[PDB]
Motif scaffolding. Sequence first.
Motif, PDB file in Angstrom:
ATOM      1  N   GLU A  91       0.853  -1.192   0.000  1.00 15.99           N
ATOM      2  CA  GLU A  91       0.000   0.000   0.000  1.00 15.99           C
ATOM      3  C   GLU A  91       0.887   1.240   0.000  1.00 15.99           C
ATOM      4  N   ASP A  92       0.388   2.322  -0.583  1.00 17.58           N
ATOM      5  CA  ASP A  92       1.170   3.554  -0.676  1.00 17.58           C
ATOM      6  C   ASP A  92       1.569   4.105   0.697  1.00 17.58           C
ATOM      7  N   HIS A  93       0.854   3.704   1.743  1.00 22.26           N
ATOM      8  CA  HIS A  93       1.116   4.231   3.077  1.00 22.26           C
ATOM      9  C   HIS A  93       2.123   3.431   3.901  1.00 22.26           C
ATOM     10  N   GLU A  94       2.734   2.407   3.307  1.00 21.06           N
ATOM     11  CA  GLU A  94       3.653   1.551   4.064  1.00 21.06           C
ATOM     12  C   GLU A  94       4.932   1.228   3.279  1.00 21.06           C
ATOM     13  N   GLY A  95       5.947   0.739   3.991  1.00 18.04           N
ATOM     14  CA  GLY A  95       7.176   0.282   3.359  1.00 18.04           C
ATOM     15  C   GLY A  95       7.062  -1.183   2.973  1.00 18.04           C
ATOM     16  N   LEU A  96       8.172  -1.762   2.523  1.00 20.16           N
ATOM     17  CA  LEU A  96       8.177  -3.138   2.025  1.00 20.16           C
ATOM     18  C   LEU A  96       8.192  -4.171   3.150  1.00 20.16           C
ATOM     19  N   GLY A  97       8.853  -3.849   4.258  1.00 24.65           N
ATOM     20  CA  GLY A  97       8.948  -4.787   5.368  1.00 24.65           C
ATOM     21  C   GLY A  97      10.118  -5.749   5.222  1.00 24.65           C
ATOM     22  N   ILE A  98      11.248  -5.218   4.762  1.00 22.59           N
ATOM     23  CA  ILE A  98      12.457  -6.011   4.535  1.00 22.59           C
ATOM     24  C   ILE A  98      13.641  -5.263   5.120  1.00 22.59           C
TER      25      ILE A  98
END
Lengths: 87, 10
Positions: A11-18
């Motif tokens: 989502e545009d409101h979050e990062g990738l999570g890596i």
Amino acid sequence: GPIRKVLLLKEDHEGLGISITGGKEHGVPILISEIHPGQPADRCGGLHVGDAILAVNGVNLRDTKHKEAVTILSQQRGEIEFEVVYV
Amino acid sequence: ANSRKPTSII
């Protein structure tokens, strides 16, 4: 191992999570060092600690310095295709 | 001194 094409929906409101390490100035690939629980990479599947990221959205990351790779990766939006491999 | 490998969150 085999090179895989892996899709991640962010989502545009979050990062990738890596978390990543490596890059050209280290003489090793951009490598996934962490997959953060409950964030997009984790939820979407297909990406694992120890995978080298060879490209994102067609952009070659094989000969990219760490910082520049962070920029390229962080700039992507939406349906993001990774090219990855585990060796 | 030796250093830990640079790690970035994205």
